[PDB]
Amino acid sequence: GSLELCDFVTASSFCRRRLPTVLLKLRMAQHLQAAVAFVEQGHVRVGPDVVTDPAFLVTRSMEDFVTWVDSSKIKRHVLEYNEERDDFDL
């Protein structure tokens, strides 16, 4: 759009782009304190890299490539619930 929408940017817009709240949008977490907690142990990666800083704004392009890190206990539970655990892929 035009410059009209440019006057709506506030602290809320910046807070919505934080890494923990994106997990909360993506339904990877259901509570903010749980979403924050997942980050520092290192269960969450943005592409190849693992991000431990809760204060981290993720781009729209990078938002497509956020997922559980491999060899994480949470990813085991997701695969177990879906009956799709394959131990060859570790």
Binding site: S12, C15, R16, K25, L32
Partner: peptide, 21 residues
């Protein structure tokens, strides 16, 4: 100021709100 964390608008923009409604 941001809304309450329990609010859905905390993590949803107007595009998501239109589709979710």
């Amino acid at each position: 100021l941001p809304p309450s964390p329990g609010d859905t608008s905390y993590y949803q923009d107007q595009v998501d709100d239109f589709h979710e409604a």
